[PDB]
């Protein structure tokens, strides 16, 4: 939206009533642990390939 705040040094503006609100924050912390065997992946249990 568009909001004009009229600056004037004779006046301040202080609110009267205050509320309490709850929000949400989501943060990743870790990912999936993996491990790779060499010969099983690349050669697939072939002895002459190994």
């Amino acid at each position: 939206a568009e909001n004009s705040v009229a600056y004037s040094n004779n006046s301040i503006a202080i609110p009267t009533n205050f509320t309490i609100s709850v929000t949400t924050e989501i943060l990743p912390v870790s990912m999936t642990k993996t491990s790779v065997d060499c010969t099983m992946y690349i050669c697939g249990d072939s002895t002459e390939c190994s």
């Binding site: 491990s35 065997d37 010969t39 099983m40 249990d45 002895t47």
Partner: peptide
């Protein structure tokens, strides 16, 4: 690890995989 002295810890070495005993061939009867 290519070493004669191995420090304390867990290490991945090999597989429980079996090497093939023989060769099998199969055709329609």
């Amino acid at each position: 690890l290519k070493s004669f002295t191995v420090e304390k810890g867990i290490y991945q070495t090999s597989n429980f995989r079996v090497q093939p005993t023989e060769s099998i061939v199969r055709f329609p009867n």
